[PDB]
Short mmCIF file of N, CA, C and O in Angstrom, two decimals:
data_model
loop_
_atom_site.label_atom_id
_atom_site.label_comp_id
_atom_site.label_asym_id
_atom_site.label_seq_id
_atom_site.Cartn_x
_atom_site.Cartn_y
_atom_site.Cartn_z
N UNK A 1 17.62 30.88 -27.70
CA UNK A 1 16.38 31.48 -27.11
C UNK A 1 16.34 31.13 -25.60
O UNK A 1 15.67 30.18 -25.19
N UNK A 2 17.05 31.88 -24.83
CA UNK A 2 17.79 31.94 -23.60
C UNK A 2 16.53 30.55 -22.35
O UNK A 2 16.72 29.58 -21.62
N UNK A 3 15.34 31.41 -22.87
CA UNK A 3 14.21 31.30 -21.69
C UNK A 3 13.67 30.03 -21.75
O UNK A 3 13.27 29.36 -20.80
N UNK A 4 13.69 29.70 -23.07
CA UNK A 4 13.47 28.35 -23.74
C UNK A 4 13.40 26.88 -22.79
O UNK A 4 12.45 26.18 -22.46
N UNK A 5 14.92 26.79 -22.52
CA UNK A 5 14.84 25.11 -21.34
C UNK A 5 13.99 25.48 -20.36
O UNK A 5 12.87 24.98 -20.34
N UNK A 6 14.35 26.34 -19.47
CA UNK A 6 13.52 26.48 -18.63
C UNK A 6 11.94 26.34 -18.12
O UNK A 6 11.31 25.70 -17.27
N UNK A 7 11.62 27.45 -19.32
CA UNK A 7 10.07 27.54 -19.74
C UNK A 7 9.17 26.10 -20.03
O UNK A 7 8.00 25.83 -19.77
N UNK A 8 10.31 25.26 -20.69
CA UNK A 8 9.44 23.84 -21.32
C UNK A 8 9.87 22.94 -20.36
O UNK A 8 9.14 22.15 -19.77
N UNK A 9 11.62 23.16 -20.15
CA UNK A 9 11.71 21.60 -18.73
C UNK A 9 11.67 22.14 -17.18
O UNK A 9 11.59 21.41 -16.19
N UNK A 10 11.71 23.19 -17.16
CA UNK A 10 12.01 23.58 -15.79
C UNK A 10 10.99 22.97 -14.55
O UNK A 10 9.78 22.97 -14.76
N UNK A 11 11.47 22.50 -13.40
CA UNK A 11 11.33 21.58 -12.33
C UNK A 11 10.30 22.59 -11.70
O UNK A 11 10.77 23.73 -11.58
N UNK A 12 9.29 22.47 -11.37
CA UNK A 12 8.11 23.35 -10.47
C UNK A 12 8.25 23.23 -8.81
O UNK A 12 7.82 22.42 -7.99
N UNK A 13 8.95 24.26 -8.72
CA UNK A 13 10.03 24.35 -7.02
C UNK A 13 9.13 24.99 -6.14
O UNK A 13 9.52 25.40 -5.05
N UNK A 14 7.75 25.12 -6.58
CA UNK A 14 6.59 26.03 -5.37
C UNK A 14 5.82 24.43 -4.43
O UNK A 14 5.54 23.41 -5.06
N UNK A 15 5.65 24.52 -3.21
CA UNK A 15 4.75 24.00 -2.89
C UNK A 15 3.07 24.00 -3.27
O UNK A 15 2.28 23.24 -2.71
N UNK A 16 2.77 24.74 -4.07
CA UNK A 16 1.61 24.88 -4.06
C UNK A 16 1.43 23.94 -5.57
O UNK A 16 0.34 23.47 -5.89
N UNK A 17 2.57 23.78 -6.33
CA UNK A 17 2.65 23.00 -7.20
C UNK A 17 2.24 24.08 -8.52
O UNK A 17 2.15 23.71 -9.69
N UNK A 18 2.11 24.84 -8.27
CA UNK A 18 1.12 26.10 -9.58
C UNK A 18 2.18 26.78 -10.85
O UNK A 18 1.92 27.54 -11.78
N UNK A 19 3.54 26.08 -10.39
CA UNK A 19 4.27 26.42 -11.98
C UNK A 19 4.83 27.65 -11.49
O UNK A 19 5.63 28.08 -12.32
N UNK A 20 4.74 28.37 -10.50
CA UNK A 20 5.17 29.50 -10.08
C UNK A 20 6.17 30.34 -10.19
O UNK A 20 6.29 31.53 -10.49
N UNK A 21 7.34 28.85 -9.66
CA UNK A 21 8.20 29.01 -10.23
C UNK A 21 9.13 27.48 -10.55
O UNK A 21 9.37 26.47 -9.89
N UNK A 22 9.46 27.96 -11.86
CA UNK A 22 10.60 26.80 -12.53
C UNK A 22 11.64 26.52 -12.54
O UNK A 22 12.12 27.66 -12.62
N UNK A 23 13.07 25.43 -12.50
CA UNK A 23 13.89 26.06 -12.14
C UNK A 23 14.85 24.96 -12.58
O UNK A 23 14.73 23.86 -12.03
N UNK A 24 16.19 25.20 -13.92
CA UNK A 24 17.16 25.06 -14.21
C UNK A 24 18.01 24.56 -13.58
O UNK A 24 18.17 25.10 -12.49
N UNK A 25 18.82 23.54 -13.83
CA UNK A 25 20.57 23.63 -13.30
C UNK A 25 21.35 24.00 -14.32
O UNK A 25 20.87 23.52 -15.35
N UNK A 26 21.94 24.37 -14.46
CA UNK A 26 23.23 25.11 -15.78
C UNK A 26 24.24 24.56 -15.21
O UNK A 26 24.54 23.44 -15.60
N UNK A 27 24.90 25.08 -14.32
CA UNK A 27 26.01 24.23 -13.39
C UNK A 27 26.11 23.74 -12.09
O UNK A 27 26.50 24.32 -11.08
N UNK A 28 25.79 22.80 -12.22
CA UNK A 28 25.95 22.20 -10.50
C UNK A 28 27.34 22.25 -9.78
O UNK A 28 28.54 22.10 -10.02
N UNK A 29 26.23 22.64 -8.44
CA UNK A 29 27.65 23.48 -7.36
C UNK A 29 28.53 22.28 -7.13
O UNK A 29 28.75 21.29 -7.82
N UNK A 30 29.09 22.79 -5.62
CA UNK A 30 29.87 21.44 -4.93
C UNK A 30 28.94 21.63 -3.33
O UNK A 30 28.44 22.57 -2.72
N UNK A 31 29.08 20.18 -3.14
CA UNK A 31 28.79 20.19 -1.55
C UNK A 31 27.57 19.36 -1.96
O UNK A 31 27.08 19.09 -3.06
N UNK A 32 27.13 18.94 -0.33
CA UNK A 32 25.98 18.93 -0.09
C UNK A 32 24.73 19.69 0.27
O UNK A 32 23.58 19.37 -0.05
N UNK A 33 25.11 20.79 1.01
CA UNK A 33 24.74 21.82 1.86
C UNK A 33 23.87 22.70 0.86
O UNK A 33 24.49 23.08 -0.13
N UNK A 34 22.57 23.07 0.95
CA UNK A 34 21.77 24.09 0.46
C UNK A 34 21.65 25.30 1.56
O UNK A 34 21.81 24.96 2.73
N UNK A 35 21.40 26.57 1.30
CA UNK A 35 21.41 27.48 2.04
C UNK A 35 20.04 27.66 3.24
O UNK A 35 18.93 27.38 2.80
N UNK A 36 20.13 28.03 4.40
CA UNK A 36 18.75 28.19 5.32
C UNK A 36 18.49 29.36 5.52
O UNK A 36 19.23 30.34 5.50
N UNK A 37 16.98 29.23 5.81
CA UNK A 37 16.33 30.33 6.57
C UNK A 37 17.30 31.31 7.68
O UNK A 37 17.51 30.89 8.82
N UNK A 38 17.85 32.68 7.21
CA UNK A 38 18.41 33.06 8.02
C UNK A 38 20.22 33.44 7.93
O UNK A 38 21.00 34.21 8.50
N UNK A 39 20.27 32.42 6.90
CA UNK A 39 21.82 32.27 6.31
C UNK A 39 21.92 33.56 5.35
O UNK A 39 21.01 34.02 4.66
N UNK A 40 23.63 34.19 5.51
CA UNK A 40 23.78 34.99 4.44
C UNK A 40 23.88 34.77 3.51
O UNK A 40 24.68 33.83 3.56
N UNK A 41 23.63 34.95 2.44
CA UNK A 41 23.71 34.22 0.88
C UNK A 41 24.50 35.47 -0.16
O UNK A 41 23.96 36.53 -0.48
N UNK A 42 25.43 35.18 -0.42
CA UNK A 42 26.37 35.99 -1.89
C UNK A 42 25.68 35.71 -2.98
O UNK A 42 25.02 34.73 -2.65
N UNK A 43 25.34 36.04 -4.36
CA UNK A 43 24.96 35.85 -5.42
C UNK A 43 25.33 37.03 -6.38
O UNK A 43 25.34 38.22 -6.07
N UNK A 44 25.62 36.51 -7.56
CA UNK A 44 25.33 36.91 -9.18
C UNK A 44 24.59 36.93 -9.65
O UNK A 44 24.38 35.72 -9.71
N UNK A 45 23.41 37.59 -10.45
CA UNK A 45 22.65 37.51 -10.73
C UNK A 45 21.77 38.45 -12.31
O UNK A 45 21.40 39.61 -12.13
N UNK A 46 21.65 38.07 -13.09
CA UNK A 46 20.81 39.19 -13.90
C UNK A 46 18.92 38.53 -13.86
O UNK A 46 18.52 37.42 -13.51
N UNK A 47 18.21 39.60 -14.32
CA UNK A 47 16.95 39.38 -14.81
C UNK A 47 16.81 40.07 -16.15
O UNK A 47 17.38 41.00 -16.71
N UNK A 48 15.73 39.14 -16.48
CA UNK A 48 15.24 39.36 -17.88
C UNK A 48 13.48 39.42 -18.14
O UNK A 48 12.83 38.51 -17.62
N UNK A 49 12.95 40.20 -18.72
CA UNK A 49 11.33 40.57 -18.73
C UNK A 49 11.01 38.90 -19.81
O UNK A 49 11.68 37.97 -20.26
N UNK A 50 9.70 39.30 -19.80
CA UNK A 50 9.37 38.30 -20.87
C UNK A 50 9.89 38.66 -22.34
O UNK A 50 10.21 37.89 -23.24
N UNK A 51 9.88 39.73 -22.34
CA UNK A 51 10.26 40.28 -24.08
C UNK A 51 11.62 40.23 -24.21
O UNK A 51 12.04 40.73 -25.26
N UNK A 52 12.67 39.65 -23.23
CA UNK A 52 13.70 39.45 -23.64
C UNK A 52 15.03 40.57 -22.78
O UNK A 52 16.23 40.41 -22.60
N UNK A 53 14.02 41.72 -22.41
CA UNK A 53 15.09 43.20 -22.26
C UNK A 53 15.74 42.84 -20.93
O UNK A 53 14.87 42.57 -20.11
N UNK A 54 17.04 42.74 -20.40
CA UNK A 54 17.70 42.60 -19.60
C UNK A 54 17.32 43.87 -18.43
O UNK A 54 17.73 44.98 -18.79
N UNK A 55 16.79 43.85 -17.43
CA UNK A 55 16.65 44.66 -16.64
C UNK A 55 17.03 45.17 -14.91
O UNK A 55 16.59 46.15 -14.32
N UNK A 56 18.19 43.85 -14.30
CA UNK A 56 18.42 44.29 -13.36
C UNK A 56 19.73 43.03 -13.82
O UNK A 56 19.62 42.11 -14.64
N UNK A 57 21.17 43.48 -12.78
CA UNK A 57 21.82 42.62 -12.85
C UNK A 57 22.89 42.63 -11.54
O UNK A 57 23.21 43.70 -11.02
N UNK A 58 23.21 41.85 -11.26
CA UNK A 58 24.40 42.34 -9.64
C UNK A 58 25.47 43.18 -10.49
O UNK A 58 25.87 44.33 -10.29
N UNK A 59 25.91 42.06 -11.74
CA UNK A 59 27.19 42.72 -12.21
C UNK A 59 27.04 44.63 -12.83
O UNK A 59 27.96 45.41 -13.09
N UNK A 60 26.05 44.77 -12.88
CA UNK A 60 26.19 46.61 -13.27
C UNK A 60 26.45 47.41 -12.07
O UNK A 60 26.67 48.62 -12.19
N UNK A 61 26.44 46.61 -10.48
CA UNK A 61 26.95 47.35 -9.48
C UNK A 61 28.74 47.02 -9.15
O UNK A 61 29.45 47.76 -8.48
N UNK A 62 29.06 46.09 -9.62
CA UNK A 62 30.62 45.38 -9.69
C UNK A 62 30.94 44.72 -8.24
O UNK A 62 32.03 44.61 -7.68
N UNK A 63 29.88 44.40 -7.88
CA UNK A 63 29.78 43.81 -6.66
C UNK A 63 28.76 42.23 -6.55
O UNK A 63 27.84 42.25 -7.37
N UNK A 64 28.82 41.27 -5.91
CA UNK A 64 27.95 40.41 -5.88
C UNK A 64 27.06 41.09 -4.97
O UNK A 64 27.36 42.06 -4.28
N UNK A 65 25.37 40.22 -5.05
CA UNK A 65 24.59 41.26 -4.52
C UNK A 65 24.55 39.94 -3.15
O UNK A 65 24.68 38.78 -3.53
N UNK A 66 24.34 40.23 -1.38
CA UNK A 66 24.35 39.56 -0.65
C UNK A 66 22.93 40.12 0.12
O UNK A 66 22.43 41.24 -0.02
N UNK A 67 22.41 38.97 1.02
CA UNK A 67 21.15 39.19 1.04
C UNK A 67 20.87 38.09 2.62
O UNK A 67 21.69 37.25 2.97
N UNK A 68 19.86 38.29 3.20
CA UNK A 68 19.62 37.02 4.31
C UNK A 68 18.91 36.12 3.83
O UNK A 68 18.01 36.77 3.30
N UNK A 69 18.74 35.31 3.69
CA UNK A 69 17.94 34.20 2.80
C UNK A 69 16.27 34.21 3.87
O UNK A 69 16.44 34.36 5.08
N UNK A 70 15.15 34.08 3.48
CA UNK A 70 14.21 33.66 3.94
C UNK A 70 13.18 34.92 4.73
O UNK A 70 12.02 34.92 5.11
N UNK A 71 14.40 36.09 4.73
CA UNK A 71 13.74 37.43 5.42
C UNK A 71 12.85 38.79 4.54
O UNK A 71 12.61 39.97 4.78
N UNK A 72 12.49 37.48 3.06
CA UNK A 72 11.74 38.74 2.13
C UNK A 72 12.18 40.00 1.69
O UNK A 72 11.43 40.94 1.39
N UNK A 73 13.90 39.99 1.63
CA UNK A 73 14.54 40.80 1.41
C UNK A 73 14.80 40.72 -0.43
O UNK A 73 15.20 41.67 -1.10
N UNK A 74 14.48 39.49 -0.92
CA UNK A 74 14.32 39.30 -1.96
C UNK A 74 12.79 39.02 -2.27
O UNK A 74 11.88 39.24 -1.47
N UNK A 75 12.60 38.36 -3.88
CA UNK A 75 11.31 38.49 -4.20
C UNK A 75 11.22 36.88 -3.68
O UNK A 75 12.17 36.22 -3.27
N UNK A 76 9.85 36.44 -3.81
CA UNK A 76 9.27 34.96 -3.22
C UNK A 76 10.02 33.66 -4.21
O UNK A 76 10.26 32.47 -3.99
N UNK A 77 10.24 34.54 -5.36
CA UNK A 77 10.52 32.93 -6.11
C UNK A 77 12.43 32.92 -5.47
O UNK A 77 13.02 31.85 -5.31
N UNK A 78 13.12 34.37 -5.17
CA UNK A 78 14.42 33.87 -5.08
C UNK A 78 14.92 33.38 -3.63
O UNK A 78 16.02 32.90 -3.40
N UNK A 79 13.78 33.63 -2.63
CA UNK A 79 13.47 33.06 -1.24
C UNK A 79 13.82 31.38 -1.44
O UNK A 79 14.83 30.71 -1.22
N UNK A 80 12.73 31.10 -1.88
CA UNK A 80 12.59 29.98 -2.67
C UNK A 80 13.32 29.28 -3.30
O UNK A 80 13.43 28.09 -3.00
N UNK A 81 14.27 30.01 -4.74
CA UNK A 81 14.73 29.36 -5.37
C UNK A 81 16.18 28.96 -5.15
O UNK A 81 16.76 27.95 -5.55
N UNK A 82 16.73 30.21 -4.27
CA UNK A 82 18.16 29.98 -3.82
C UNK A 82 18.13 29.21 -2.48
O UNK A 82 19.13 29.13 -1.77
N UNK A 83 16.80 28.60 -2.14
CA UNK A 83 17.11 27.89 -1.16
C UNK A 83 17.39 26.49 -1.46
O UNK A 83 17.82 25.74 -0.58
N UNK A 84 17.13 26.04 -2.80
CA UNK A 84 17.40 24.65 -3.61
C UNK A 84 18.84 24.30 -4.18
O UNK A 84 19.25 23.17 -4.43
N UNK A 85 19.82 26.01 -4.40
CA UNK A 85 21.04 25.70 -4.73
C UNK A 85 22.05 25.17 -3.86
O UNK A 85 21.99 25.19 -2.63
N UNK A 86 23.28 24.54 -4.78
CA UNK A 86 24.38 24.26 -3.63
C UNK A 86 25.39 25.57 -3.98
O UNK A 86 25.10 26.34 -4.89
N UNK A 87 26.44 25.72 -3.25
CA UNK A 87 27.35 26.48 -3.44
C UNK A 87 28.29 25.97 -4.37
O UNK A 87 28.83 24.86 -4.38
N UNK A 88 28.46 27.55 -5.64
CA UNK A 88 28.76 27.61 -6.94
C UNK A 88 27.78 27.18 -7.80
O UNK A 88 28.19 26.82 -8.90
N UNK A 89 26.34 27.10 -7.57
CA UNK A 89 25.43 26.11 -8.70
C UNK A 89 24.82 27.26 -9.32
O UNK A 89 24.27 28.08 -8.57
N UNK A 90 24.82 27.48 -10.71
CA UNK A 90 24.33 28.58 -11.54
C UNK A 90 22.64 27.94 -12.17
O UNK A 90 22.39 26.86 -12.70
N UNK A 91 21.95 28.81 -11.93
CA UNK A 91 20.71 27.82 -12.13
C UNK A 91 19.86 29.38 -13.00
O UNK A 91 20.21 30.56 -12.99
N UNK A 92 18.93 28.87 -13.53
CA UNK A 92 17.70 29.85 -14.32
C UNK A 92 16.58 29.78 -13.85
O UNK A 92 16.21 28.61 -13.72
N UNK A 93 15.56 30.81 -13.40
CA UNK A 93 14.44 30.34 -12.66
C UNK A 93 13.19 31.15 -13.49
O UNK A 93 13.25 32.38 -13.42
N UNK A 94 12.35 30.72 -14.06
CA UNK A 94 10.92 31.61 -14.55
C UNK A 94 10.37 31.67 -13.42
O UNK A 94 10.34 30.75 -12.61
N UNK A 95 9.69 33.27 -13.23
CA UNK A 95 8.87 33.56 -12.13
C UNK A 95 7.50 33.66 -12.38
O UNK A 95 7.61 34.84 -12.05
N UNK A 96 6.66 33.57 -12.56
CA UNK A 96 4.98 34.25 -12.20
C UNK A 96 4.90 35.03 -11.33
O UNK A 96 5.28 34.88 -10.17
N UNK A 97 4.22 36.27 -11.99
CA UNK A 97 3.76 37.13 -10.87
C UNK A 97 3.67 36.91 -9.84
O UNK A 97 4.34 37.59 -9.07
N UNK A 98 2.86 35.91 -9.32
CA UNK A 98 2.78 35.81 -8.00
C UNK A 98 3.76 35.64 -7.29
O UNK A 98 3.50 35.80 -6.10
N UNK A 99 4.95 35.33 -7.55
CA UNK A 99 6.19 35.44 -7.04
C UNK A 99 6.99 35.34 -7.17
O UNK A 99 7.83 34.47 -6.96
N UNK A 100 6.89 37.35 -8.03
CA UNK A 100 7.37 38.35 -8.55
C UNK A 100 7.39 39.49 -7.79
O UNK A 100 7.89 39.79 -6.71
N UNK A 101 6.50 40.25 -8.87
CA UNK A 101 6.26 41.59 -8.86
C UNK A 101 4.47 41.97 -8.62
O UNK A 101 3.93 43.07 -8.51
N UNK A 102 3.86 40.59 -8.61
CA UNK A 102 2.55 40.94 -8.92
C UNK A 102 1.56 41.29 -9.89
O UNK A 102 1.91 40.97 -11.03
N UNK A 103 0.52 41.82 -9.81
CA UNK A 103 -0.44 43.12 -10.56
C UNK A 103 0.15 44.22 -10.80
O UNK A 103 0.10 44.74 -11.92
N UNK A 104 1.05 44.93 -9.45
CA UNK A 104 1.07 46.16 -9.64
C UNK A 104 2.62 46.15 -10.64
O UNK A 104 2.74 46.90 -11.60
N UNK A 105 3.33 45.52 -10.36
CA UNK A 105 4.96 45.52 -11.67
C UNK A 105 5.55 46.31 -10.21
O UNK A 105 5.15 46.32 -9.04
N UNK A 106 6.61 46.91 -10.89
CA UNK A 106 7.51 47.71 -10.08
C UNK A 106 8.43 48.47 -11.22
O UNK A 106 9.22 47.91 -11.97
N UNK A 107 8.01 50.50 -11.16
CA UNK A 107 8.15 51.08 -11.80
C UNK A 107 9.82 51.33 -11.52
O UNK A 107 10.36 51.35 -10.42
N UNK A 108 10.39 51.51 -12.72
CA UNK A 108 9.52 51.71 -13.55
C UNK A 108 10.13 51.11 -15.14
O UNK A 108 10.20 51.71 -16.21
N UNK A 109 10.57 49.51 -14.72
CA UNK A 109 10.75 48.60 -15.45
C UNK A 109 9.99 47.60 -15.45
O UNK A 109 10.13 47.09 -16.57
N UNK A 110 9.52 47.21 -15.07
CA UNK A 110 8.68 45.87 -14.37
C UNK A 110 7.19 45.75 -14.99
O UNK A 110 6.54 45.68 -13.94
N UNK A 111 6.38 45.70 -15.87
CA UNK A 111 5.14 45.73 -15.62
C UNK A 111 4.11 45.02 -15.07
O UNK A 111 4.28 43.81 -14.91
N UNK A 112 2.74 45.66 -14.64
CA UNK A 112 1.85 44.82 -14.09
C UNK A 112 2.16 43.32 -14.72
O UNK A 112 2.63 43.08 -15.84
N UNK A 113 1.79 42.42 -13.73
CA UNK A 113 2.06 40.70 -14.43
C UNK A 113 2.19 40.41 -15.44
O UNK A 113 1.73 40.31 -16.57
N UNK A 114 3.62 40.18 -14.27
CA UNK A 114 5.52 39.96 -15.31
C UNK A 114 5.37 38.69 -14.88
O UNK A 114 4.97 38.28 -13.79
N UNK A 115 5.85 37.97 -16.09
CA UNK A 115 6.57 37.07 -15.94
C UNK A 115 8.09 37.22 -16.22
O UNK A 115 8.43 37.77 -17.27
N UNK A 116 9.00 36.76 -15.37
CA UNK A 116 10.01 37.38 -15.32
C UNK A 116 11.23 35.71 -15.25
O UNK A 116 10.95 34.65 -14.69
N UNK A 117 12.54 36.04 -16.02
CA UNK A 117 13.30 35.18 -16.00
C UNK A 117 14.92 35.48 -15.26
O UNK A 117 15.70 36.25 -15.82
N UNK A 118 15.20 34.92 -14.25
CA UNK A 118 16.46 35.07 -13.79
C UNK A 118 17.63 33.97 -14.01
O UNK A 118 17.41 32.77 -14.22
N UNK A 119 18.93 34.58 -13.92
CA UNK A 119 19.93 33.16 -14.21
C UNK A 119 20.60 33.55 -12.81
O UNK A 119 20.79 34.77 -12.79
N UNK A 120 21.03 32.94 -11.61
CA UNK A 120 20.79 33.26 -10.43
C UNK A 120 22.80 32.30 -10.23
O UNK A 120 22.86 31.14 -10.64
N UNK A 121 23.67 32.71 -9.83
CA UNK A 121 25.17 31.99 -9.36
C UNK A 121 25.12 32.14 -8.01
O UNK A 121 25.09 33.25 -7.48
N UNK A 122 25.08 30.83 -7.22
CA UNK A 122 25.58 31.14 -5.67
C UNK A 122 27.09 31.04 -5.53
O UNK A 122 27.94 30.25 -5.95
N UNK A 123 27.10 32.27 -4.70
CA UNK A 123 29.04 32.18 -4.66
C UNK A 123 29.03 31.68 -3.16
O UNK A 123 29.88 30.80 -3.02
N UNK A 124 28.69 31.82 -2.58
CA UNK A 124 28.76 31.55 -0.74
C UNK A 124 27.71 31.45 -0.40
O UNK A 124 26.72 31.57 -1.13
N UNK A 125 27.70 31.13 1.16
CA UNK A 125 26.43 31.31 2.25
C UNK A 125 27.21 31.05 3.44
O UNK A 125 27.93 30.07 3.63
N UNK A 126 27.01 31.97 4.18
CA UNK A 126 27.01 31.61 5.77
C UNK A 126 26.10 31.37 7.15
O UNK A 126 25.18 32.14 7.43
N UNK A 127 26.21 31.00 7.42
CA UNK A 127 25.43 29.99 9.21
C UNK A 127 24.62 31.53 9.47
O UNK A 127 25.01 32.67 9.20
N UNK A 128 23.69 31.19 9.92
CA UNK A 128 22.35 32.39 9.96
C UNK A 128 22.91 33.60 10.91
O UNK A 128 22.21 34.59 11.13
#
């Protein structure tokens, strides 16, 4: 029951402290180095709804998905959450709406407040 560790042990990685979002290690990377504000970031990635249905994933494009870290190009919890990984660290993160998708969801998989579960692989990052 995939969502399971997470949901019950997962580490509360929001400043606001509100459970927002939670967050797994599965495999710890190498290094010391976590990614910054500004840095390119590579990743693997799928999501999963609360009911289980797999709904977005890098691997259905056959590409890793790459992104700027910190420029809201992603959603708030993966701003956030890939800023805690090291490189190669495969981690699981529960989201709350609030930083998610919100009230409104995002059609036309997503519904109004999702709680939503990701398993998130950093493959790289580079200097901003």
């Amino acid at each position: 029951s995939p969502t399971a560790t997470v949901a019950e042990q997962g580490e509360d990685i929001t400043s606001k402290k509100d459970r927002g979002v939670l967050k797994i290690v599965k495999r710890v990377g190498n290094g010391e180095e976590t990614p910054m504000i500004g840095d390119k970031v590579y990743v693997h990635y799928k999501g999963k709804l609360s009911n289980g249905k797999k709904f977005d994933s890098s691997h259905d494009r056959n590409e890793p998905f790459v992104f700027s870290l910190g420029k809201g190009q992603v959603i708030k919890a993966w701003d956030i959450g890939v800023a805690t990984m090291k490189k190669g660290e495969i981690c699981h993160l529960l989201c709350k709406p609030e930083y998610a998708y919100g009230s409104a969801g995002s059609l036309p998989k997503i519904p109004s407040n999702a709680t939503l579960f990701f398993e998130i692989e950093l493959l790289d990052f580079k200097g901003e």
